[PDB]
Design a binder for these strands. Structure first.
Ligand SMILES: [Zn+2]
Length: 648
RNA sequence: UCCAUGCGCAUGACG
RNA sequence: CGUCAUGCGCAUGGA
């Protein structure tokens, strides 16, 4: 470990009290400095012989594993106890004990919160902040009054004001805080920005920001920002489909009040889908669903090879066929829509073969294929775009590979942490990555960062500029010109603004600063209390059975309220095979489907039972016709299951 | 190592 | 407040 000069002074006040913030660019290696603040705090406590604890926090697991790999252990391997925690790395020994041991802690946020709640919520193990003498944080810009991290700072604040009302005194920890450029939220002025910054600091109860101004020279030596650059590159098939859409409006008497190829049409479609669900009618929500599909097909067609819309609707309508045949094992509505499609499908694929939207960016990348293209990065919005384009390039054009996140959403096969690590290792050796907004991932040396239809804020901008370092960092920014370049411009604008604001706040009276931060702290606390009041008022009924669940295409009875049961206190289910007389089953490569053709759920095979579980998205309520997308919205409760019932 | 599920959060666009 | 897309964390159950 070592204490680079620009790191020295910025750390300096923290060494004695001084709950602060630090914000520095990429490359400065702000972990090493943090290690010094630790070690010096620890050594101070040993000089005092008192409880020296650190309870480091992050947002992501990967950084925790990283710092347990690289930074904290290899400099504190000798003296002190460390442990690299995470919600997923199974730890046999529970959290309060690794507080009772393990002087140093890497961790991850909501671990802590959960332990605190078990302290306050139930008679469980529990833990409090009083067991500490320091907290350290990373990426403070994710701090707000809403999220985690942190809610718990509002506990720090509440307890602090308890201490102050006592003084106007049990101890409380120092609070460091680190970050990149803190950015700024939802401004057009300096004053709104400054107010944001003050909200940040007083969410941390800190004292200053304390950036670097003196030793900018060695910094700029280590930090060589690449060139801020812009680059841009920018039919009857579309029309062929728009005609059908209008034909279907005629078939349905649906008035868009807007155009095709935007979110507005989609949103109106969803609203009509609710109303037609609030009517239990047909050609009225069913066609909202279809038209959602069509509009998605459009707005990919405006950006994506129309072969991929053919793929999308191949998937869709082929699944429609399979649904209707597993149900057979069709009416005017389905027959009209399906045949309206199939009469054209083949010729539409023929059109799909034919080459603005279709000739795109071949030169935009082959320029660098010819210049160097060793390294490659691509951003975009979506998942499906990535798979699609990687397929398209593997067919037409450089060996490539995709990348996306992890979550269970979008009706896609997601990826896995492991396989992400695989990919980034291969890239530390693949030439070009295709990614969504994922890239706190360790990458560098690159040159050809680009942007295929992006929006994102200043921080994603500068952090993407952190990766492709000072070697021909040709930042492209693609978009069909018909204000996306405006977004890079405003990112520059905010980059100016945060500096202009930091300067205006570093240079401030301590008294006035204290008054402002005190008022923001009290505001945040009072708002949390209002939140808790409204929230406690939220759930009130808790009724066993007041309802009937119905199919939403056919307004048909599907379940009552008391016949339902629960498992895991998560999933709902209906035994009582009177119900079982209804449904149909499907699987390919299981799923419950309808007598009409609606999708209903999954045959959850657990606990030695084929419990038929369902999803309330797909059903509709009758206590007003209401839809929720999740069970928890109503308060009215259902029982937990009794296996003695299933006595044979 | 993989699969299934619930919950909460932020971001950006949109009304 | 509602919609969409993206990303993150936690908690369950199974192989
Ligand atoms: Zn039905």
């Amino acid at each position: 470990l070592q204490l680079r000069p620009y790191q020295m002074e910025v750390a300096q006040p923290a060494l004695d009290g001084k709950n602060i913030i630090i914000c520095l660019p990429t490359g400065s290696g702000k972990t090493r400095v943090a290690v010094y603040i630790t070690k010096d705090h620890l050594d101070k406590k040993k000089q005092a012989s008192e409880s020296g604890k650190v309870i480091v926090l992050v947002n992501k697991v990967m950084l925790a594993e990283q710092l347990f790999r690289k930074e904290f252990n290899p400099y504190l391997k000798k003296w002190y106890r460390i442990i690299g925690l995470s919600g997923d790395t199974q730890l046999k020994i529970s959290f309060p004990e690794v507080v009772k041991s393990y002087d140093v802690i890497i961790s991850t946020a909501q671990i802590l919160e959960n332990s605190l709640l078990n302290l306050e919520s139930g008679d469980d193990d529990g833990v409090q902040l009083s067991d500490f003498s320091l907290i350290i944080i990373d990426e403070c810009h994710h701090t707000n009054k809403e999220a985690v991290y942190n809610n718990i700072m509002r506990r720090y604040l509440k307890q602090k004001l308890r201490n102050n009302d006592l003084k106007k005194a049990i101890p409380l920890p120092q609070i460091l805080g680190l970050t990149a450029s803190p950015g700024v939220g939802a401004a057009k002025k300096q004053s709104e920005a400054e107010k944001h910054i003050l909200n940040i600091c007083a969410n941390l109860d800190a004292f200053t920001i304390k950036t670097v101004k003196e030793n900018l020279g060695q910094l700029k030596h280590q930090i060589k920002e690449p060139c801020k650059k812009f680059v841009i590159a920018d039919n009857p098939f579309k029309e062929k489909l728009l005609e059908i859409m209008a034909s279907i409006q005629t078939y349905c008497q649906k008035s868009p009040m807007s155009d095709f190829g935007t979110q507005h049409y989609e949103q109106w479609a969803i609203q009509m889908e609710k109303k037609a669900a609030k009517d239990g009618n047909r050609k009225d929500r069913v066609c909202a669903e279809h038209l959602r599909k069509y509009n998605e097909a459009l707005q990919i067609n405006d950006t994506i090879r129309m072969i991929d819309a053919y793929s999308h609707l191949e998937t869709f309508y082929t699944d429609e066929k399979e649904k209707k045949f597993a149900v057979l094992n069709l009416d005017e509505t389905d027959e009209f829509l399906m045949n309206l499609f199939f009469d054209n499908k083949k010729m539409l694929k023929k059109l799909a073969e034919n080459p603005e939207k279709l000739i795109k960016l071949r030169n935009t990348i082959l320029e660098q294929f010819t210049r160097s293209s060793s390294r490659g990065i691509i951003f975009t919005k979506t998942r499906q775009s990535t798979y699609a384009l990687s397929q398209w390039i593997m067919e037409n054009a450089v060996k490539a590979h995709h990348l996306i996140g992890a979550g269970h959403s979008s009706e896609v096969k997601p990826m896995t942490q492991t396989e992400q690590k695989e990919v980034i290792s291969k890239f530390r050796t693949i030439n070009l990555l295709i990614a969504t907004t994922v890239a706190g991932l360790d990458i560098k040396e690159c040159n050809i960062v680009i942007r295929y239809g992006l929006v994102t804020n200043e921080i994603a901008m500068v952090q993407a500029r952190g990766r492709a370092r000072a070697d021909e960092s040709t930042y492209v920014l693609v978009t069909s010109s018909g204000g996306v370049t405006e977004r890079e411009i405003v990112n520059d604008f905010r980059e100016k603004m945060m500096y202009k604001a930091i300067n205006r706040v570093q240079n401030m009276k301590p008294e006035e600063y204290a008054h402002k931060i005190l008022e923001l702290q009290v505001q945040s606390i009072l708002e949390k209390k209002m939140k808790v009041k409204r929230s406690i008022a939220k759930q009130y009924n808790d009724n066993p059975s007041l309802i009937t669940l119905l199919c939403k295409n056919c307004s048909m009875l599907v379940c009552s309220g008391e016949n339902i049961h629960v498992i895991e206190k998560m999933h709902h289910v209906n035994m009582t095979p009177e119900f079982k007389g209804l449904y149909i089953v499907r699987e390919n490569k299981g799923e419950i489907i309808c007598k009409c053709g609606q999708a209903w759920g999954t045959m959850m095979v657990h606990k030695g039972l084929d419990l038929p579980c369902l999803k309330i998205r797909n059903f509709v309520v009758n206590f007003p016709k209401k839809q929720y997308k999740k069970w928890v919205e109503l308060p009215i409760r259902f029982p937990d299951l009794d296996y003695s019932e299933y006595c044979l």
